[PDB]
Symmetry: C4
Subunit: 153 residues, 4 copies
Amino acid sequence: QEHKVIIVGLDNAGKTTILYQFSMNEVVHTSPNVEEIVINNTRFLMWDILRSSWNTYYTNTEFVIVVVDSTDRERISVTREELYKMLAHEDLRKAGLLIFANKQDVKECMTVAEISQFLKLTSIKDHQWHIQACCALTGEGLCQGLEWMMSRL
Amino acid sequence: QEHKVIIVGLDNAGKTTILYQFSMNEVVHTNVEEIVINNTRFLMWDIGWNTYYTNTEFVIVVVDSTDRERISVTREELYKMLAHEDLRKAGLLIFANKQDVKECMTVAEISQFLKLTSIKDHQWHIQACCALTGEGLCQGLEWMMSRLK
Amino acid sequence: QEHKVIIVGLDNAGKTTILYQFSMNEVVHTSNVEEIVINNTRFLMWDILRSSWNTYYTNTEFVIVVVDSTDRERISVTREELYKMLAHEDLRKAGLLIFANKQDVKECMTVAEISQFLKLTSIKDHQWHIQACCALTGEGLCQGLEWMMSRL
Amino acid sequence: QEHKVIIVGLDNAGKTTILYQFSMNEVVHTVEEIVINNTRFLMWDIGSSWNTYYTNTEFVIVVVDSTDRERISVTREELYKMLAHEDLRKAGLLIFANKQDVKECMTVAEISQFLKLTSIKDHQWHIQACCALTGEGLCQGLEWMMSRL
Ligand SMILES: Nc1nc2c(ncn2[C@@H]2O[C@H](COP(=O)(O)OP(=O)(O)O)[C@@H](O)[C@H]2O)c(=O)[nH]1
Ligand SMILES: Nc1nc2c(ncn2[C@@H]2O[C@H](COP(=O)(O)OP(=O)(O)O)[C@@H](O)[C@H]2O)c(=O)[nH]1
Ligand SMILES: Nc1nc2c(ncn2[C@@H]2O[C@H](COP(=O)(O)OP(=O)(O)O)[C@@H](O)[C@H]2O)c(=O)[nH]1
Ligand SMILES: Nc1nc2c(ncn2[C@@H]2O[C@H](COP(=O)(O)OP(=O)(O)O)[C@@H](O)[C@H]2O)c(=O)[nH]1
């Protein structure tokens, strides 16, 4: 079984770097923007996100990973708008939500608690969710996010 | 077999948020909530002729680490509660909540003020946490697991 | 089989509080001379005139040295006692665990500063580990106990 | 089966101290052989005629002095020169950002960015903050190596 995971977030958030770092992660099996990521016996198929009749992103999707640039205080309102537009889709009713508060290495960034509060994460009533501080330049924090998704299978 | 836990603290401490976050925690299987960890079932009561204290195995005390004015109030209630006959064998887990807030009391400051290292008749653990993110909550739950009979 | 551990350090370092907190630690089974059980392993821990003998080093498997991180005035005394102790042939096979205690207090010596002052990386004939800790919360104590377990 | 490992870096980086501390590490059983669980590593702290990277080098550990802003460019050049060697094509790369205890040192993220680590295409790599005076961070570096066998 392949478990479908999509990676969303605004440009420059760290989506490419995060998916790349997943392959280097200690809990992820070694392997030589659509990557199969294997943890123990579990296979995830991860997608880093006109003539098509269909938007295919949300279909059969088990986890959405939202990447947030923690340094960007102005665009966070845009991330929030997109988060809630996305959560309004019936396709995602069963999906777990993992939020990466990325670029936590940068001084004066928003704290993970400030991000949780602004995004009103504790008001979410119909989805499992987890917010995780991370730095995609080092992979710090990514293992914890992946292990949370594993616990939600 | 259900293991009874009561969650107590002053208003605005974080009780509702902590119990909600338990449901989202990595160690937990997906006012009164069943929380399952591995094969262990906890029945957790958020407090706020009957007594909620009956058959309690764990007391979780939530402390707002920013509330310097009312930590004296929490201390008095803590020790008043520890003297109840229903609670004499109970494990005590103290969450020093709102640790994300700048200039809050530190967990060591809270331990020292509450005189926790002077407790003689109860297993206890104090744990820094932030209920907005669930950080610290896993460690608190894991400590309770290790105190199961 | 009891594994003998001694807890040493200057007055006010935190020896009493640490031994107390061992009883509350997640890795320790719920239960100044105390039996501490971790999984199946039993440690007999002693927190240290008319006696003919120094009995503290006899058959001692681990020495826990508790250092007050805030105490810059007496760190040289800790160092002297550490090396006098380590010169004892009785302790030739003992593992050394150093708790850099009171890490919660602002402007305390860092664990690296303590290690450098104590010249710990110059130790040639003993297994050793230094661990930051706060005895008021038990933070750091688990890591210290796990290191001893790994040295059995 | 011995898994061969070389430890490299400029003078004063912390190579001697790190290899020393591996033998004191919790995950390690009590030029050196380091055993983790059932796995034997043979580790050479590099620093001659007819000498080169010993055959079947499985891991390269690069030690970076985090305080050394002047010479991090020197280290970057040596790193990529090493990564160009055909006989190191299958090698895992573990970078220890050492001396993280020293105030105002480069952060691990600054080091990763300067070394352009996330642009590496042909190797498994991990960067790990550490302090060789205490051993902090060494365990995680060793564990990453174990996961790459
Ligand atoms: N300082 C810092 N930079 C990062 C981090 N994650 C990614 N970046 C950088 O931010 C830029 C955008 O990253 P990228 O992964 O391409 O973002 P994407 O547009 O969401 O796919 C690149 O220069 C990355 O190196 C981080 O955690 N900290
Ligand atoms: N900044 C911060 N706010 C928190 C934390 N935990 C809870 N809160 C907020 O504090 C307020 C009271 O929390 P709540 O769970 O309702 O407290 P209760 O009265 O004890 O049940 C709410 O607005 C929460 O979102 C925390 O760790 N940090
Ligand atoms: N702030 C702080 N105080 C501590 C810590 N550990 C112990 N203490 C306090 O230090 C004092 C001496 O501790 P004690 O355990 O009696 O030291 P002993 O003389 O070595 O046995 C007591 O007031 C303890 O509560 C700590 O980690 N931080
Ligand atoms: N402050 C600090 N000093 C360190 C650290 N690691 C090593 N050193 C010291 O730096 C010096 C050089 O270390 P060494 O292991 O001999 O480096 P080598 O030349 O690469 O083998 C010695 O004095 C060590 O004690 C560290 O993490 N922090």
